[PDB]
A paper describes a structure:
In the best characterized pathway, importin (IMP) α bridges cargoes bearing basic, classical nuclear localization signals (cNLSs) to IMPβ1, which mediates transport through the nuclear pore complex. IMPα recognizes three types of cNLSs via two binding sites: the major binding site accommodates monopartite cNLSs, the minor binding site recognizes atypical cNLSs, while bipartite cNLSs simultaneously interact with both major and minor sites. We combined bioinformatic, biochemical, functional, and structural approaches to study this phenomenon, using polyomaviruses (PyVs) large tumor antigens (LTAs) as a model. We addressed this possibility by x‐ray crystallography, and solved the structures of putative bipartite cNLS peptides of MWPyV, STLPyV, WUPyV, KIPyV, and MCPyV LTAs bound to IMPα2ΔIBB.
We also included JCPyV and HPyV7 LTA cNLSs as controls for strong and weak monopartite cNLSs, respectively. As expected, JCPyV LTA cNLS bound as a monopartite cNLS at the major site of IMPα2ΔIBB, with no electron density for the peptide observed at the minor site. The thermodynamically dominant P2 pocket of IMPα2ΔIBB was occupied by JCPyV LTA cNLS K129, making interactions with IMPα2ΔIBB through hydrogen bonds (G150, T155, D192) and a salt bridge (D192). As expected, JCPyV LTA monopartite cNLS co‐migrated with all IMPαΔIBB isoforms, implying direct binding. Indeed, JCPyV LTA cNLS bound to IMPαΔIBB isoforms with Kds between 76 and 270 nM, whereas bipartite cNLSs measured Kds between 0.1 and 36.1 nM. Most monopartite cNLSs are fully functional, perfectly fit to the consensus (K‐K/R‐X‐K/R), and can be expected to bind to the IMPα major binding site in an extended conformation, similar to JCPyV LTA, SV40 LTA, and several other monopartite cNLSs (Alvisi et al., 2023; Conti et al., 1998; Smith et al., 2018). Furthermore, all tested HPyV LTA cNLSs exhibited IMPα isoform specificity, with those from WUPyV and JCPyV binding preferentially to IMPα1ΔIBB, and that from KIPyV binding preferentially to IMPα7ΔIBB.
Author numbering:
A (entry chain B): 125 to 133
B (entry chain A): 72 to 495
The structure:
Amino acid sequence: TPPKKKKKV
Amino acid sequence: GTVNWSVEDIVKGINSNNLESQLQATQAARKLLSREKQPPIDNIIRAGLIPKFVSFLGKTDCSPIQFESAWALTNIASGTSEQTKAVVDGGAIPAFISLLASPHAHISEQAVWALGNIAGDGSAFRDLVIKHGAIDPLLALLAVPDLSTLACGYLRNLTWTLSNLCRNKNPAPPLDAVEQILPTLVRLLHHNDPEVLADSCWAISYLTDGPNERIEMVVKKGVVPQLVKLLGATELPIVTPALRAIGNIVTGTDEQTQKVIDAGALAVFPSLLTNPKTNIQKEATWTMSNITAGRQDQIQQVVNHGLVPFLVGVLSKADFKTQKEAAWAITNYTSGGTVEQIVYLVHCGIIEPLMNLLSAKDTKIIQVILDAISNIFQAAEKLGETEKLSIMIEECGGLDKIEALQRHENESVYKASLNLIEKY
């Protein structure tokens, strides 16, 4: 499954 | 310049009455929250910085601070539900929705990303984002004649956030919101970027994971053929969500399942049922089980596509969870099939692998197998060939396993085994 949340780096 | 700042220095800069100092401190915070290792999210929250970032989101005259605060708040909202909640409690949702209309593409993208994190927290924040009116501006961002003119990362972020707006249950997204989003989802489902395709397929899978009315909303848009095409893709990130969506759809009415069959889906299952990835095999066998639970002509399509030998193969050798899905498929087949179809099943070699699976330590699979054997025996009675099947089950060592089951902890297990031995 795609990530529920993503951090921008 | 703004690298490796302390939280106290960030607070000192943001608490200054100097917009440029505030901007440099906000960039320092962004870089701190972008650190790969233990970003100090909780310290940032404790310092009371979220309301300041949210206020900075409204500084139309200082686009850089809008962007830096958007990125910082995105990386706070990317954490725990408590951290995402801290972002939401600061009033960030309406400010990000307002930023969706920014003339700067990177700021609008950052707002899309932040809203995606917030909505991805769960159904409550998802529905709150919807209530604040995010869908209209989000979809407006994709109202172009050709999606190929948009930047790849921009389009991917929009697709991902939209997929989070279709995600989660208890409750599922508002019906009107799903109707509003679905056309853009279909358009994205026809795009030629693998990530956009994967996330659009995952969105459709979420939308189809529910009651038959939801499945119908999706199937009425005519996406099933495109889903089967994507099921044939070479990239696993695409096949996986496509297969999940198809399985969900075949959990519905027999007419929806017939739409899957009509689109040519069965022709892909020789590969899927032998796919080297365990999860693909498992979900393909689960889809097969929900297809064999349908009408006799649908079972006949399964037979015509040569898929019964592949079910025998999965039952003979596969991960145990795939083998359980296969036992379920066999039991559904025997429950709804004609006598000729069950005869075909036996002629393909189902008895030996089913008997070998009777040695499992999972009550449910034993019940499934014993029920399948009972159904097959009923067909044999209809043909007066119960003795042939009894001999066949004996030669492969099945009678020993069923006689052991006669003394099983579960009530129905020993009941069915005793009935099978007594009557046969």
